[PDB]
Design a protein around this ligand. Structure first.
Ligand SMILES: *[C@@H]1O[C@H](CO)[C@@H](O[C@@H]2O[C@H](CO)[C@@H](O)[C@H](O)[C@H]2NC(C)=O)[C@H](O)[C@H]1NC(C)=O
Ligand SMILES: *[C@@H]1O[C@H](CO[C@@H]2O[C@@H](C)[C@@H](O)[C@@H](O)[C@@H]2O)[C@@H](O)[C@H](O)[C@H]1NC(C)=O
Ligand SMILES: *[P@](C)(=O)O[C@H](C)C(C)(C)C
Ligand SMILES: *[P@](C)(=O)O[C@H](C)C(C)(C)C
Ligand SMILES: [Cl-]
Ligand SMILES: [Cl-]
Lengths: 532, 532
């Protein structure tokens, strides 16, 4: 039986799923760790104990416990990111889509979901692996990992809540893929990890962490990089926020043991309800429980690792969307709303700048304002709105990614950079938001191939082009088909810094992505802040 | 006799001078102070004692003792600025051009020469007042004043070398004009002071100083403003440089009395030979002996005077040239030379930035570099050369002037702003230097009306247009002829910030002159430097 697979953990039975007038096999909700429940809350994951009989892998698993977005009830633009299954702390499962007939030793791609480390689900419609697995003939895996305090509460020095456990959940799923994917017809020596936003940061973190490097071959990072300002905190800051969470829940704070015990007694929703209260600043694009620079998962600071070439040397493919900032401004900044053009007054610009760079002193804020204000036309509401989008996008996504790409490329074995700038014809969000954080994912996963979803012909073609770049890259370390006539995606090099756009128009090659602003964010501002 | 005038100081006999197929009267070398020689060196000027008989005013006076430019011997571009008469400490004289027949009560314009407070002469060919006096029917006066240490050595607290004596020379010439110009047919109630570079700064300083305000009606400032970073120093810095001059000349430094006595024994050239050695920094566009913020000539800081409206409220006309920086880069910065295109390497750019902003710390230098580097094309030699021109021009001339105009306009009675951007067809300097510091002067003084000087027809027309703006402004407080059909030079207002270009093409109105860079120079950089 094509739907029966024996693994080192036991037998699993999958399900035949229709896809684009054909079918493939899906193995959904396979456990890769023991349920991290009770006294196991906050602890490192434990390998799943093997089972007897046949694991029923016909249905999606529970999602991890998380904050749920209720800002626009019933609206598909926001609800498409929310858990679509029951939430449980029992949530460490993976999903595999397998071509039919079962392959022998094919390329494997492992998806790591984003969600700012506070949310996310492997089960979202937008992460349905069937289209990519079917079209490009890869074994497509999606893993899961604990988010929020359950994944990232960090009391450094404790073994009960050491931090980074969600990253260790991801590593354990990669370990399981390494050990077992061959039985599904996957080649464990040709595994590509790929992820978006926090999943992109996570991919970079596995590139860096000595304990993860050997578990995959190559990597794709979408709108995320390990050095993003929101993606990690120090052990002191992690400790502070954990104690502040305890304070919100009226915990005994006299020791780590007392705090952890109190926190373990709470219902999951109790933690989630006060999660946002522990942030040190009035901010946007900052999240409470995130990876911690611990000296173990990350042996030294991210900057010193990148500078010294202390990371996995392989090929990477990565890039960003045109309007990375707009999502967070909409949700978090005055003057921005879903149902208006959100033209921004000078005053709301200033408020926005302060929320966007919460760690800056007044001089730093002046620097940012000067860098992004057109002083020939400073009361232009469109320019102010677009300026803020750029500030938030450049600071949180594009410039950290550019800093990563330039550091990585000095030691790596091949870099391909993209700029995704296609606004989908059927987008439900307002026009002012442009090409939003997260909205390339639907193209990467082939949703535009589905008739009922109402994409244009050109959008289907773009999706096929992207799926083929991603999968060819996963296969070979190069997104370009050898000896094809199509226009080539050039290698990013230190010297020429080339990248391509990704849209429905003929591909163009560009150079030096947002270089002017990234010198400001990567070199000048940090120096200014360190001096003053 | 038209050439004989009786004044309160005694009788003067002038000379009939040919001008443009006609003639006018010139009274050259009239004394307005006692010779500031011997024990009077460094002291405030004394009014000239009246004389018996007839003062022979047929020939140009001596020039004040100054550093003489020998960088390009025999080259007209540089030598046109050098003294063209014998140098003497006996140099406090003025020149008057008077229409023929002698007017009754006509508009008076008083020219104050530039030269960075270290040089300058009233007698330069380029300051020949005959063309303007003849064409526009004004009484044209040019004054003189002590420069270098002779005018500006400052030992605050001493009455023997108090500082600012060159500004007091200028005021005494204005006093003489006030008291005597009526006899030459001038109206002492309608005197316009005008000057370029240090002369423009000086004009602004007379606007500010309570002791000067009553001596003139209105004012024109060309490429200079009183708040320019090179135009004044503190009393502490003036003292330091005076003592350092003494050190260079092996003076007794035990007291002001000992230092001044030593300095008074020296031949003028002895002072001049070591003048440049007292500067505190490795710099360009900085001069050794300049006006001092003394609490007397200037009652408080220039910034507090400007902020509180502590200045003469009247009409002003002022502006700048396109390439204010190039002169000083040519003379003072590596990579720049007279006979090459002076394309600038990244390395010479950095050296240039450091010379241009000598008071900045390393962070400030980084700020300037970031503000003026095109990071998409950073090795472009033309862009680097042009970037440096802008840095030097914006920092030293344009941005201080813009700061002055905006402060002044809040309290004043009418502001007219220009941007002179015509490159003269017969310019002897290289093309890379563009529209140079000082090169509007020849247009203001009507040299393009002289056939033998080889200007184009369009340049003559531009000169006539400029002379007419300047003189109509001097007459009425408005450069525009009432009820003429020509296009109007609009008033500069706080709200609309309009200015005109001045070139051979039809006049255009623009707004917000170099506003982006001037926020950097006037607001951000000073804040950065004060914090770090
Ligand atoms: C310059 O000052 C004059 C006189 O103070 C101003 O003219 C006066 O303006 C007020 C307000 O419009 C009138 O009520 C007076 O009748 C005006 N007086 C005269 C004599 O005209 C003038 O507005 C000022 N100009 C600028 C550009 O500030
Ligand atoms: C007035 O001066 C005229 C020009 O004088 C010249 O310069 C002075 C400084 C002397 O050096 C003199 O020898 C030069 O000729 C004379 O042409 C003119 O005669 C003088 N007039 C009177 C009445 O003295
Ligand atoms: P990043 C901040 O993890 O973002 C998520 C995936 C999204 C829902 C697209 C904003
Ligand atoms: P400013 C620095 O006083 O400049 C003089 C007049 C010139 C010779 C034009 C550079
Ligand atoms: Cl947009
Ligand atoms: Cl030029």
């Amino acid at each position: 039986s094509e739907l029966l697979v024996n693994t080192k953990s036991g037998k699993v039975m999958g399900t035949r799923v229709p896809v684009l007038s054909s079918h493939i096999s899906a193995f959904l909700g396979i456990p890769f760790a023991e349920p991290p429940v009770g006294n196991m809350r906050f602890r490192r994951p434990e390998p799943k104990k093997p089972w007897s009989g046949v694991w029923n892998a016909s249905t999606y698993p529970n999602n991890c416990q998380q904050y749920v977005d209720e800002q626009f009830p019933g609206f598909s633009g926001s609800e498409m990111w929310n858990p679509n299954r029951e939430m449980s702390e029992d949530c460490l499962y993976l999903n595999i889509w397998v071509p039919s007939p079962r392959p022998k030793s094919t390329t494997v791609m492992v998806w790591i979901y984003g969600g700012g480390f506070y949310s996310g689900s492997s089960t979202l419609d937008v992460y349905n692996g069937k289209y990519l697995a079917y079209t490009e003939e890869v074994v497509l895996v999606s893993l899961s990992y604990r988010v929020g305090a359950f994944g990232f509460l960090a009391l450094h020095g404790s073994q009960e809540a050491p931090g980074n456990v969600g990253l260790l959940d991801q590593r354990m799923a990669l370990q399981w893929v390494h050990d077992n994917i061959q039985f599904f017809g996957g080649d464990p020596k040709t595994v590509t990890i790929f992820g978006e936003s926090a999943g992109g940061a996570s991919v970079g973190m596995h590139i860096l962490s000595p304990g993860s490097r050997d578990l995959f071959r190559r990597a794709i990072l979408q709108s995320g990089s390990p050095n993003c300002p929101w993606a990690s905190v120090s052990v002191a800051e992690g400790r502070r926020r954990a104690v502040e969470l305890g304070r919100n829940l009226n915990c005994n704070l006299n020791s780590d043991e007392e705090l952890i015990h109190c926190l373990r007694e709470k219902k999951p929703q109790e933690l989630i309800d006060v999660e946002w209260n522990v942030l040190p600043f009035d901010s946007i694009f900052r999240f409470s429980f995130v990876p911690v620079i611990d000296g173990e998962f990350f042996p030294t600071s991210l900057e010193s690792m990148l500078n010294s070439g202390n990371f996995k040397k392989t090929q990477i493919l990565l890039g960003v969307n045109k309007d990375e900032g707009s999502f967070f401004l909409l949700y978090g900044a005055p003057g921005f709303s879903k149902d208006s053009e959100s033209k921004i007054s000078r005053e709301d610009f200033m408020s926005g700048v302060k929320l966007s760079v919460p760690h800056a002193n007044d001089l730093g804020l002046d620097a940012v304002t000067l860098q992004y204000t057109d002083w020939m036309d400073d009361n232009n509401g469109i320019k102010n709105r677009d300026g803020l989008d750029d500030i938030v996008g450049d600071h949180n996504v594009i410039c950290p990614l550019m800093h990563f790409v330039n550091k990585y490329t000095k030691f790596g074995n091949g870099t391909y950079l993209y700029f995704f700038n296609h606004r989908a014809s059927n987008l439900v969000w307002p026009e002012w938001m442009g090409v939003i954080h997260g909205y390339e994912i639907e193209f990467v996963f082939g949703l535009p191939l589905v008739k009922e979803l109402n994409y244009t012909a050109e959008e289907e073609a773009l999706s096929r082009r992207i799926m083929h770049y991603w999968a060819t890259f996963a296969k070979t370390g190069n997104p370009n088909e050898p000896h094809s006539q199509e226009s080539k995606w050039p290698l990013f090099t230190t010297k020429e810094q080339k990248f391509i756009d990704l849209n429905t128009e003929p591909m163009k090659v560009h150079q030096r992505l947002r270089v002017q602003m990234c010198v400001f964010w990567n070199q000048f501002l940090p120096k200014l802040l360190n001096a003053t």
